[PDB]
Ligand binder design. Sequence first.
Ligand code: HEM
Ligand code: HEM
Ligand code: HEM
Ligand code: NA
Ligand code: NA
Lengths: 155, 155, 155, 155, 157, 157, 157, 157
Amino acid sequence: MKGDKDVIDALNRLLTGELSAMDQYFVHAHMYEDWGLNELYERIAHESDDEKGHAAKLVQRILFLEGVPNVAAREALNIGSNVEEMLRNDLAYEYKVADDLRKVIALCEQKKDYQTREILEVLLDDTESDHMYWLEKQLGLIDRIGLANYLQTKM
Amino acid sequence: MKGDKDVIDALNRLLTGELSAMDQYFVHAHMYEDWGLNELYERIAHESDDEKGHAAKLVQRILFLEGVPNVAAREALNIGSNVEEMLRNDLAYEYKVADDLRKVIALCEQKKDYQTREILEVLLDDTESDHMYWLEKQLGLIDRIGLANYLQTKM
Amino acid sequence: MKGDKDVIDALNRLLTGELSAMDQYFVHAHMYEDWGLNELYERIAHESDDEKGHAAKLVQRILFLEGVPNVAAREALNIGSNVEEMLRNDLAYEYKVADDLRKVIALCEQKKDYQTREILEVLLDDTESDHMYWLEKQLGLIDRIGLANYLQTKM
Amino acid sequence: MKGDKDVIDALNRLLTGELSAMDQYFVHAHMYEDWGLNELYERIAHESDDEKGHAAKLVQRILFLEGVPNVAAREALNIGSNVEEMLRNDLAYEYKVADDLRKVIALCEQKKDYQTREILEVLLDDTESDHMYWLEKQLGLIDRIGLANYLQTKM
Amino acid sequence: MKGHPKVVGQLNRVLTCELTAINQYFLHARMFKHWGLEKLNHVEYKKSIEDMKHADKLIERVLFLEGLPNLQQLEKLRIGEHAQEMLDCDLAMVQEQLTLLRDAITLCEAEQDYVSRDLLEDILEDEEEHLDWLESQRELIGLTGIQNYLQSQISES
Amino acid sequence: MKGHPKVVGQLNRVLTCELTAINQYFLHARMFKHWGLEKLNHVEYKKSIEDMKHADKLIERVLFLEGLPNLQQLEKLRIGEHAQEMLDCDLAMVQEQLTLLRDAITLCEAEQDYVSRDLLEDILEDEEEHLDWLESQRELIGLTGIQNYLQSQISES
Amino acid sequence: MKGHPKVVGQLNRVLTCELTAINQYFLHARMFKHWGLEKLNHVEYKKSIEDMKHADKLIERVLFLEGLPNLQQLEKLRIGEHAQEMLDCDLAMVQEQLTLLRDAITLCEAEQDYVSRDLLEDILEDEEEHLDWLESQRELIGLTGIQNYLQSQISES
Amino acid sequence: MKGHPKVVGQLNRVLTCELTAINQYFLHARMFKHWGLEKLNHVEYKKSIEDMKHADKLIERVLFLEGLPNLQQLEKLRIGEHAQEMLDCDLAMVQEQLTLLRDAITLCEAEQDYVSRDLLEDILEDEEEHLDWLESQRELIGLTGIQNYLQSQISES
Ligand code: HEM
Ligand code: HEM
Ligand code: HEM
Ligand code: NA
Ligand code: NA
């Protein structure tokens, strides 16, 4: 079908976001593995895979809506140097993705594009209930047990 | 059968206690899960389920004794803000439940209501040998290894 | 994340509703079991368990949104004395829960809190398609076969 | 270990190449799926996954060599509009990757970095014996049976 | 172990009453089978088997306490003519037997016979579960009527 | 639950259109089977089964909302003579039915009928997956030609 | 094979009536489900599935005979308000449809269309087994009463 | 991919030598089978199969490099009359072929043909494992004598 032009633009911005998330989670997972923190490596790598799944869904939706997916553009990556900084960068970036997803869900509701709305609602449900919540839990655990105890659990 | 009026009143007070215990263990388990402390979440959630089982037994006994179970009344919940406070509140409340169970077991013995006595004896055995003992062990472990080591084991 | 203050208030009112539903379904299931009506006992007990699941989801959402779940407050329970009255009280209370869920879904849509919207939409789907529909079917069956035939099927 | 600075630069250029390959194969696979050409979709998607595996190996090697992987930079994507153009763009880009891999293998041999040499030799073996060969076969088949017969086999 | 004479007397009286219960429950189960009410048959038969186990435990306890089990005496049987009357007779017998069990548990506690008391408490919980079942049946007859209630007993499962 | 009259009217209109879709898809599937195009048969038959499930859900929703399902009315069927015409008729009907579904979802949201809206959103995603498939088939006919495309439909799997 | 125009017309009329039967049976099955009568749901649903298979066979036969299946027309639906009325409407429709099938079998024999006749004879045996079932249900309502009969339909198995 | 002419020439020469090896190893395996030396049969046959796989890989590499595989030319075969002579001929051919492989690996490295080099390195490790086996056999003949050594080859396993 012929999708709304604004809906395709917003879907393409969400795609740029998901692809940047994929890159950041990829390099962070491998920085965790380089440090022997295999549990964080595995968690962040699976989150990069989920970002790849979200990007696949967005690309499929943009192509179905007869748009041109933009997989070339990338947002600036915020790579941390230590575990707390990388977790806080992942959290900042999940917050930005959730905000942008909410804006696009509102737009899809105004533009009557309900099916894009539920695709983005599944994406927002993953962003909130899968990894924003996990990151907030991790930062709270660092606050409770300390960073050295927290990192000991991640090996 | 027609149960003694005092025995039904005491069973209803025990029911109020068990229902308040259920609510407190429920909110505490979920506060533990919100903090990434999944082992405490699971333990306290299973204890809320055991409180639900005790309340079911008490309601069945009150109905068999031709009384009216009071599931509307609730005691004041003592919700903690940090792990030690929630464990100490659960311990205080288990102590109160055990005291009240002993009073009602004495009453059931005076009123010849032996079967209510063994129902409450099973309840008291759970209260003591299942979670009062566990809470005392947990507070002793916090005293031995420290709170940051203790919370690290609970993730 | 930091949820909207009105969304947390509405989620807490929904939580009070779900907890009162749990209590009412609990005492009604046990009143059905006391009368030998084991099929109603089992159905209403499973509905009390579903109310507990809904309350768990609401508590998790309120804690994620950095609110304080209120598991202490309870609405007035409307306990019936005979089977038709308890079924009609359960239906009245399901109607009230569905109305209040619709109001909160509208509020979550206005407040851009889409994820709370889908949590409450799953809750509303259960409330309508799981037990409001069942209760209406039961009252229609009582109207068709009579109360003595209806109760005979519930043993 | 501390890798040679030139070897890390060359590994990072290979990483940029692999990541651009991933993006191009991703959008091409989905453009094939949008057209009902499911066999090309599946083949090109698996090749995007192999590019992700190569990029993972390169990132792991750059981190082991105490370098900073650059997952932010991306080369210009050459997206085709019809099947022959996308196959020819994938072939051009595989040719460029193979040339650049050979240059870096020569550099790793001069810099005594033998282990990077075998990592890149496995990458070059995949690039040649897995998908450059496949693309040349596909273009030869288009030349032999025609484009309409070729596309019929790809559904 | 030489038991208290009062405890052995109470156990022998509970035994008389358990044997009377066995006989009444079996007669009622077979009267129910004769009428085609099979689920009532099954319930009354498993209840007679249960009182059979109870009498076995009481005999073994009276023998361990160096007493003489009295299997010769039986109480008067209340045999009903129809289902409701039979259920009421069963109810009356369960209630009398529960009063007896409570008196015996009180006496066993007064004599520090605590394993006799544990035995009698198991018998009490069983008899009072059957009391619950009989009260459920009476409520079901009041709710669905006797014809609907009896129709539910035709098939054993 | 007493539903809104507007929502029940919209659901009944979506039901009319789902029934028309069932009939058109089955006629087209059997016209395809008659020509030996078996994979097109299979697709159109599973699509008619899918619209069958959709009509079932709409009937159940209209009944739950205390409305009267209208299974009597059907829309005009667009039956093609050849494969391309049949696929175009299917496309036109999917597009009309998607417009209808979007209007009904808008109205269901305006009336706070959120489970009706969830129902209609499932129907929308299904209808729009079939729209995707039909557009894929048209692109494949444009790419491989109609004779090559029809040759790929001879075998069902 | 080019079939007789009269045989194709009769098959198209039997098809109209089979489609009307599908719609009426499904509406009635879902009205029964809405009332909690689950075994009546199950029967009416499997009967609608059966008339679905019948319509499929008639469409395939009309297509093989180089005719045009008419899935557009439907007859008037008799939708009842309560169980007895719905069963009577189903009975009336089965009887009308059996008369139609007998006329079509007679015509198929007169035109030496013997595989059309075999098709219609399978449809006849199925429709007349459902006629038997509906008459059984009416006799059961007369025997046990409508309240007892409806109580037997609450559970699907 | 268009390969270097020198690399394709070297691969074609290694291919000629691999084909000559296949022929010599098979003739020797069947000469061993004809004498009842079954374990020597088995070794020489699996070695001919191995050089068969090597020739397959070289043909595929020469084809991928847009060259023309030369399966027409073969080198002179050294066929022995007795076991020791056949093993010495096999040894001489393995040594010549290893020298050739080393020259080809050097040239492939000089031309940055690294997958050709990996191919040739697999062929080198295989040929040099067989060189090891042949040297082991010569040492075993020197240790146990030719009559004892040949007696150990009678049974294949
Ligand atoms: C002193 C009186 C009695 C005692 C202590 C006694 C005890 C028992 C016990 C322990 C069992 C086996 C239960 C099991 O393991 O499942 C049994 C079985 C049975 N009893 Fe009795 N019983 C008594 C009298 C009677 C009477 C009076 C009747 C019938 C008129 C009766 C009928 C049966 C039947 C039919 C069985 C099943 C047979 C079997 O075990 O296979 N009993 N009894
Ligand atoms: C031209 C009219 C129709 C024809 C020829 C037809 C044919 C069929 C056939 C052959 C089946 C599969 C039966 C089986 O293998 O068990 C089926 C399934 C079904 N039909 Fe229809 N049908 C028609 C119209 C309808 C209508 C109007 C409805 C509802 C309003 C409906 C509802 C269903 C349902 C719910 C199913 C079950 C889905 C499934 O097979 O899993 N059908 N139909
Ligand atoms: C250009 C020359 C040749 C090439 C490239 C070649 C290649 C092959 C290959 C790849 C196999 C299958 C190996 C496996 O998968 O286990 C095979 C099998 C075989 N070869 Fe050759 N071969 C050649 C010449 C010969 C000659 C000259 C003979 C005999 C005089 C021979 C005898 C056999 C036998 C007996 C088999 C076993 C049959 C089977 O695979 O089931 N080969 N060959
Ligand atoms: Na530690
Ligand atoms: Na009845």
